[PDB]
Amino acid sequence: PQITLWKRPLVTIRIGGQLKEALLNTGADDTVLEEMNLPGKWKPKMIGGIGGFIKVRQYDQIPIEICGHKVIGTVLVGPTPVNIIGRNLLTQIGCTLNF
Amino acid sequence: PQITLWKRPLVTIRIGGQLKEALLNTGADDTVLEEMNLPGKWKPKMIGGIGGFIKVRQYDQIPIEICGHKVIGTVLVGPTPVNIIGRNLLTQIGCTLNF
């Protein structure tokens, strides 16, 4: 699809077969999800943003579907105010910026 | 152009006569540049993201050329970790996400 940028580019994602709204974010290296009790092994990570750093849990090889497109990779979980799909998954779904 | 996302989408911009490198950021509502001088009146604002809130100077109706495309709009200046082009200017240069 084509997504204009008049509004926040929010799309539906599926992680654990369960559905969330997430922001397609070219300014994010990684994918960060709002706090959720995801099962699996994780490692601690600190990620940086506009205001400083936050601590998150890093889960690897997690299947995720983005607007119907299957992906699998690293997902970070922590106290982000919005679910964020970052470049690690945007590349897997063949997402580009065009102008 | 069409820009893939395996690397950070950094482009050259010209603003107030000066060349800088900036990140095309669909996850930002606003454009925020690293500390610099700009001509004209500004107003104090705060903006937020991951890691919290920072204080910025808001300059209105500022011309900026982004990867060869002209925009004129709001530019925030403050302690951002990187120069960010947000949706307010991405829309002006006709940028969409596509997959």
Binding site: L23, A28, M46, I47, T80, P81 | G27, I47, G48, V82
Partner: peptide, 10 residues
């Protein structure tokens, strides 16, 4: 209301 979701991983 946060609005600028720059994110970087070290």
């Amino acid at each position: 209301r946060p609005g600028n979701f720059l994110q970087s991983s070290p």
